[PDB]
RNA sequence: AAUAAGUGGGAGAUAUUAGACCUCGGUUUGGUAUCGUCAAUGAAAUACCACUACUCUUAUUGUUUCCUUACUUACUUGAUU
RNA sequence: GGCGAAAGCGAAAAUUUUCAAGUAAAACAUAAUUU
RNA sequence: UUAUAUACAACCUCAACUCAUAUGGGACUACCCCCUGAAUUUAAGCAUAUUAAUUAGGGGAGGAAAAGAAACUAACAAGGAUUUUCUUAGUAGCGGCGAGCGAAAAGAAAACAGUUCAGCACUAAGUCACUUUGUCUAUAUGGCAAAUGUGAGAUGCAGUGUA
């Protein structure tokens, strides 16, 4: 019996909609490093003589790092939070979904703690909370956030109330089911 | 070394030689903390001196100094030092005398 | 098994007194009957639940008092329309009846003269402990200033030996903005007569003469 | 910041959350030996709060000690001399386990210093701490001068000489008058200081 | 995190169940008579937030 | 009126009815009413209306040196390459 | 593997990823093998 | 992708290497540091006291070591980091109230040097280290860029900010 803040992991939103969640994230990788380098070396030669302040357009992507994220949740600038579940220990991510009902912001959980770190060029990442509200991905934004509502955020009001968990398993359960299968074979002739 | 007035009823008289220097006195006396530190004050940031005349007691003792303090220039344009540079120690003092009096009781 | 017009368990704050004026579901007059669920307030000792609260609005208690006067009760009492008698109704208050549709114990609270005290347990005493309307000496009985306050809603409550309470204080047919200053001053006038009070009771009970008991915090 | 939350949840031990996250974690933590290296500090944030960053490479070593008293090594019927000196089966050691659990790194590991420590869990047959070692001559650590302090020669092996967390606290160190000896330097270098007679040049 | 079970075991005790010994059950527990009085009333702060918000 | 838990408020409530008004019940007015506040007179003035709670009673999530029984993954005990 | 404040242990260390010697060998931990 | 039926890609715990590249047990000990803690002796005997928080005690350092920037004092007309000396003082209490033990702020003297970590907001990892190729030289486990070649690094690096 793991206490019913778990299972907040790992009932995790079947992967047919989850692959669409990553398709927003394909546009919101933080920075390619040469593209980071080609952006900052243009400061060195062009905008050192250009004296322009407009054409940067700091592109909004999804933020990483746990110590980044829990500012962005509490300052109410975040839009969607993805936290991993294959995680250590729990204390970086245990209390974190509980914030989201009290802070109203829709969140979600994902399978696979490496896949958030596959694209961000780090190793393992565990904390990706989204801020982007742009019109190019505003169309597919609304339908996926309605899906995580009842699965994660409206589920969040009854998830602690219903979990015993920790089934016995499994060969002993066969012997557990053996006697009731035995005694039902006997119960057919008692009242008969 | 500014401090006065040794603790208990054994002493309502004497005054030990100055380990405190009362940060909260200093803003009421024209300083200027870290500038006074490389002057040399023994500026120490932990004493919270409780009495107004003991606040005043070092205040005059501050202004006893800082005037005979001869202000050697840093950029040697000497526009902002700003007491003097013509009172340079070869011209004026070069004393290096020890005793540093504590008003002698 | 509680009622809607008389709440029992649900404890409101300061804004939950506005609907208590709706207890007038009748059309006739109903006298509100206070009661308290008391703890460790034993009546057989000197703790006698007997006094007077001074409700600054008039809830019109139907007050008739025989004013026993010996040159001190009715001299300044013409400002409050006293009966102006010479303390001679005591000779007919017991052992006989006055007239048709009248009893011999026909009041709620009684006043006595200061020099007419030893008669009060002897000739009228044994006929009034059977009524329980016995006037005491601590129930605002001096009749120097106790005349203008007589129509200004004076009550007298006698403590029962079965641990109950039902005495007339006023009514509920008027506005609850009157009752905002009625209960919040009468119970503040109840802290001073009760003893050792910091937190010894959990709630108040308030009941009308034809209604179920409501409960306030 | 998440860390001030996750310390605030670290304290609330006697839960069903932390205890039955200790309960899985504790007898996970025993089929491994008395020593094995790990990559990652189980508490991160109390591997933080301890003078700690995470460059290459601030290693973490699990360690157990045997959770008990200490019995005095004399064979089978105890000490000679005096009845001030009989009693064994309840005698108690002095240095706490949180400074024994860094000697039992510093000599088995011949290569590294010792920085701080923090407990994790406790059950009846071990208490069992972590050790935040520091590398000494990774050619990074010379040019990392906010933690340059520990690789002067006089700070190495700070498990014996008692200047870790607990080994500081073990010898009775502070000021003032709950500590008034020990004051003469270390601890009982008091009790060679004050008995030191000064037969003057000129009395 | 739920409750630390002495607070919960006394949460039953501060319902009606003999507050005085329940208070001394904390000073037996924690226990210093300066520290226990804060941990006494902390339970009632939970209990005064869950007298009518405790419905559903 | 007994048999008023008791004891005090109360010095008539409530119900009914048509009328008044409302879309209407109803409240009110007056008539009537098992009793009664009143009288019947004593230990409580019984109508009207009670906080309380037990003789206890049906039911609920009770901590229990609780007892007894299964469970097994913690742990203890071996076996085999 | 273990325990001891450490030195070291009046010790059938039989538990210690592979704690295999390996073997002319084959993909796809070379095969049953070696405590 | 796990009827225990295949790949690939990560991750996670985790190996093996006559790999690369480098750090450590040891000697001494007077002084110093954390350790373990005995005894004749004194009480006219002895058992708690004492020898003593002591000789072996051994594991650790150095030209310093530990302490040190108070979770202190004192209670006053206040003081103010740590260490040693004079005195506090053979006084306060601990004591088979036996023998005997035993400090201390406060007073004056040398010297004087104050400040980084953790953690809100600090607000584009802006970080750090190898590698190779050159700059620059030098008996440097070296200074400048670069390929942005790795990897470390968000499970958080940096700057500003601390009883």
mmCIF file of C-alpha atoms (C1' of nucleotides) in Angstrom, chain B residues 1 3-12 14 16 18-20 37 45-51, chain H residues 69-70 74-83 88 106-115 163:
data_model
loop_
_atom_site.group_PDB
_atom_site.id
_atom_site.type_symbol
_atom_site.label_atom_id
_atom_site.label_comp_id
_atom_site.label_asym_id
_atom_site.label_seq_id
_atom_site.Cartn_x
_atom_site.Cartn_y
_atom_site.Cartn_z
ATOM 1 C CA UNK B 1 39.501 52.606 19.131
ATOM 2 C CA UNK B 3 34.601 52.679 23.034
ATOM 3 C CA UNK B 4 33.714 53.877 26.525
ATOM 4 C CA UNK B 5 32.222 52.685 29.842
ATOM 5 C CA UNK B 6 33.188 49.249 31.345
ATOM 6 C CA UNK B 7 30.273 47.116 32.500
ATOM 7 C CA UNK B 8 29.166 46.677 36.102
ATOM 8 C CA UNK B 9 29.112 48.538 39.424
ATOM 9 C CA UNK B 10 32.867 47.977 39.666
ATOM 10 C CA UNK B 11 33.134 50.667 36.986
ATOM 11 C CA UNK B 12 31.031 53.692 36.441
ATOM 12 C CA UNK B 14 36.783 53.783 33.386
ATOM 13 C CA UNK B 16 38.209 50.266 27.846
ATOM 14 C CA UNK B 18 37.938 50.625 21.800
ATOM 15 C CA UNK B 19 37.076 47.314 20.145
ATOM 16 C CA UNK B 20 33.490 48.162 19.110
ATOM 17 C CA UNK B 37 37.628 50.942 6.438
ATOM 18 C CA UNK B 45 29.990 45.759 12.094
ATOM 19 C CA UNK B 46 28.793 44.237 15.412
ATOM 20 C CA UNK B 47 28.041 46.622 18.210
ATOM 21 C CA UNK B 48 24.701 48.298 18.542
ATOM 22 C CA UNK B 49 25.543 51.101 21.011
ATOM 23 C CA UNK B 50 22.538 51.989 23.091
ATOM 24 C CA UNK B 51 23.068 55.490 24.491
ATOM 25 C "C1'" A H 69 33.488 36.290 13.466
ATOM 26 C "C1'" A H 70 29.180 34.313 19.240
ATOM 27 C "C1'" A H 74 26.881 40.513 31.779
ATOM 28 C "C1'" A H 75 21.848 43.216 34.061
ATOM 29 C "C1'" C H 76 25.302 47.642 34.650
ATOM 30 C "C1'" A H 77 26.143 55.694 33.344
ATOM 31 C "C1'" A H 78 27.018 48.742 29.417
ATOM 32 C "C1'" G H 79 30.318 45.389 26.686
ATOM 33 C "C1'" G H 80 31.428 42.578 22.039
ATOM 34 C "C1'" A H 81 35.799 37.149 17.223
ATOM 35 C "C1'" U H 82 39.708 33.238 18.571
ATOM 36 C "C1'" U H 83 44.042 31.958 21.153
ATOM 37 C "C1'" U H 88 40.300 37.365 39.133
ATOM 38 C "C1'" A H 106 34.106 41.186 34.212
ATOM 39 C "C1'" G H 107 39.602 44.750 35.120
ATOM 40 C "C1'" A H 108 44.699 45.670 32.332
ATOM 41 C "C1'" A H 109 49.069 43.910 28.131
ATOM 42 C "C1'" A H 110 50.932 42.001 23.110
ATOM 43 C "C1'" A H 111 48.498 41.547 18.329
ATOM 44 C "C1'" C H 112 44.797 42.777 15.377
ATOM 45 C "C1'" A H 113 41.322 41.039 9.625
ATOM 46 C "C1'" G H 114 37.709 40.571 8.220
ATOM 47 C "C1'" U H 115 34.235 37.569 5.152
ATOM 48 C "C1'" A H 163 23.660 34.391 11.520
#
